[PDB]
Design a protein around this nucleic acid. Structure first.
Ligand code: G2P
Ligand code: K
Ligand code: MG
Ligand code: MG
Ligand code: MG
Ligand code: MG
Length: 592
DNA sequence: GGTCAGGTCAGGTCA
């Protein structure tokens, strides 16, 4: 059946004027207060919990323990992440039914269900609605994190930039009631406004879009020869060049916006008809040449480049950019190294003047964002030996590369992991499936690759560092899952935890070992399987020590094989958790 | 049973 209740406000319901006859009269006073609360002054200092304790009479809850149990899930909603869920069970289970006065008159057998129902009501009709009334939730796009802005200042931000967009031709109204492709959302991006579109779901045309994008990636393969895998690029470049590596990374400003629809349409028509049929060709071009979008119940045309959020703008922008930089890429200096994922260029060469020339070559052809550009060039004001590109960190001097992590200060790492799956729901009495499914290798698979475990251009100690960081991530995921077990499963009778923990350390060590042996490097000495597993456990402890009273049984059990080969490993790094992970917030508390 | 090939689901990466 269904054992999950979703935390997102999306599923909320607009409160009725009166209680529905099914629910008890008590709720109405809450409802009344809610209306009063909505009418109440919209003071900018606002805490959802305080206002919420006023509108909801405590008498509904009866005892303070019952009330606190309910406001715990309210707090969870205030601190929610995308896709997060709780068990519906938690809304009735372990509630002191003797305290609830209105329930006391009713027969005990029906008390849970009724309670459940009523609790459900108050969340969908009051809690989620009032939160949505005072606050607006926007995805940070860093993990599953959700930032809560005051509704007023978000509407002012979105309308400010909406007028800043109507004034310029970027957004016009074509006003012929043409069907909206999707709804435009404006979601803050530091300085930039990052305007995107949530397309409306179309299942009938989705296979056609997939066919189209497949054909376009095939024209990118057949023509404009693939630039090559970044791993082998870096490998051959570091092996062939012995001198100091000078490199620059540049971020194209509004890569999708500044594409020219006329040029891209006439480029789409250029494709030979056997690789793309002319009827399909015409579809591609009139799709991208006519982009119609619904804003505040109004429809507008988008005439600035490729609309972001489309199901065919990515492959098209790649087609455009890759064709457009063919001249440089086709033949450069044999010494030189260049690579672009999408909108992000990375160029390294022994000769500094060449890197300088490349910066100015790209800067003239396109308009860049100058804060995002990173280089070790002496002429630049803040040269760095470590340059970040494609979710990795390349140190040009050391020639070492390490996984890049994006953890702002005060960031709560629990956001990074999706523990709840509404399509495949685990019952509350099956904690083992939840914890296991959380610890399946697929989530860290990206970091268990050649790039991070190769020793061809990576030092052995840097291989150790990458694996240690990956295991730290795994452990934070484990701890988050444990908290989820305690918050919603609430299964106190749990001893299966250690089996999953140990099995996962074993298996991840095996995977990293098998990928490390396959991509043996010249810098490779001897790499223990045993001390790799031991490093996994020390990485765990670095995280579990953050909640040592709650975990002390487990951590003391862990301490009782940690045997660490080669003198280059400092070994201080493995005992103390890295500085990046020390300040991430592992306790959730309502900040609104 | 042991491979494959297709398909599906899942969680992660990049921009
Ligand atoms: N549909 C989506 N497209 C995206 C997403 N992220 C990036 N992109 C596309 O990748 C391109 C690069 O995005 P970036 O985040 O690097 C910033 P953008 O290039 O839009 O401009 P600047 O902020 O001036 O750097 C962007 O133009 C678009 C996404 O989450 N969804
Ligand atoms: K960016
Ligand atoms: Mg970028
Ligand atoms: Mg960009
Ligand atoms: Mg991660
Ligand atoms: Mg997915």
């Amino acid at each position: 059946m269904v054992h999950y209740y979703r935390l997102s406000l999306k599923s909320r319901q607009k409160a009725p004027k009166i209680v529905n006859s099914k629910y008890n009269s008590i709720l109405n006073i809450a409802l009344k207060n809610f209306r009063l609360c909505k009418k109440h002054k919209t003071k900018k200092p606002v805490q959802i919990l305080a206002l919420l304790q006023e509108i909801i009479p405590k008498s509904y809850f009866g005892t303070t323990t019952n009330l606190k149990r309910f406001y715990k899930v309210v707090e969870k909603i205030l601190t929610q992440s995308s896709f997060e869920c709780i068990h519906l069970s938690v809304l009735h289970k372990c509630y002191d039914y003797d305290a609830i006065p209105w329930l006391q008159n009713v027969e005990p057998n029906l008390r849970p269900k009724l309670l459940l129902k009523h609790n459900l009501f108050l969340l969908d009709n009051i809690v989620k609605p009032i939160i949505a009334f005072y606050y607006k939730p926007i995805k940070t796009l860093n993990g599953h994190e959700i930032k809560f802005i005051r509704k007023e200042e978000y509407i002012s931000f979105e309308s400010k930039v909406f007028h800043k967009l109507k004034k310029m031709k970027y957004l016009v109204e074509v006003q012929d009631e043409v069907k909206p492709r999707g709804v435009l959302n404006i979601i803050p991006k530091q300085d930039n406004f990052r305007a995107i579109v949530s397309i409306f779901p179309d299942s009938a045309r989705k296979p056609f879009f997939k066919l189209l994008t497949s054909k376009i990636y095939k024209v990118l393969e057949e023509k404009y020869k693939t630039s090559g895998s970044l791993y082998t690029c870096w490998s051959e470049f570091t092996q062939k060049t012995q001198g100091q590596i000078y490199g620059i990374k540049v971020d194209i400003r509004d890569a999708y916006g500044n594409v020219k629809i006329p040029v891209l349409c006439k480029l789409i028509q250029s494709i030979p008809t056997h690789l793309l049929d002319s009827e399909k060709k015409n579809f591609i071009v009139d799709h991208i040449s006519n982009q119609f979008v619904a804003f505040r119940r109004k429809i507008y045309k988008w005439n600035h480049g490729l609309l972001q959020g489309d199901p065919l703008s990515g492959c098209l922008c790649e087609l455009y950019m890759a064709f457009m930089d063919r001249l440089y890429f086709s033949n450069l200096d044999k010494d030189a190294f260049i690579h672009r994922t999408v909108d992000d260029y990375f160029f390294c060469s022994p000769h500094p003047h060449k890197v300088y020339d490349f910066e100015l070559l790209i800067k003239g052809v396109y308009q860049v964002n100058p804060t995002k550009t990173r280089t070790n060039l002496p002429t630049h004001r803040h040269p760095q030996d470590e340059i970040p590109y494609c979710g990795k960190i390349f140190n040009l001097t050391t020639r070492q590369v390490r996984t890049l992590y994006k953890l702002p200060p005060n960031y709560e790492i629990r956001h990074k992991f999706k523990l709840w799956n509404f399509n495949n729901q685990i019952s509350d009495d099956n904690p083992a499936r939840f914890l296991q499914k959380a610890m399946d290798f697929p989530f860290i698979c990206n970091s268990f690759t050649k790039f991070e475990f190769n020793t061809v251009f990576n030092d052995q100690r840097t291989v150790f560092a990458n694996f240690y960081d990956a295991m730290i991530c795994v452990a934070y995921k484990f701890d988050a899952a444990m908290m989820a077990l305690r918050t919603s499963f609430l299964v106190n009778d749990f001893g299966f935890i250690w089996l999953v923990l140990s099995s996962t350390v074993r298996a991840y060590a095996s995977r990293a070992f098998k990928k490390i042996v396959t991509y043996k490097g010249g810098k490779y000495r001897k790499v223990t399987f045993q001390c790799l597993k031991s490093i996994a456990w020390r990485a765990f402890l670095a995280v579990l020590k953050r909640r040592t009273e709650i975990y002390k049984g487990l951590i003391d059990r862990i301490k009782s094989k940690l045997t660490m080969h080669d003198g280059e490993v400092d070994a201080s790094y493995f005992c103390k958790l890295p500085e990046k992970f020390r300040f991430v917030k592992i306790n959730r508390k309502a900040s609104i």
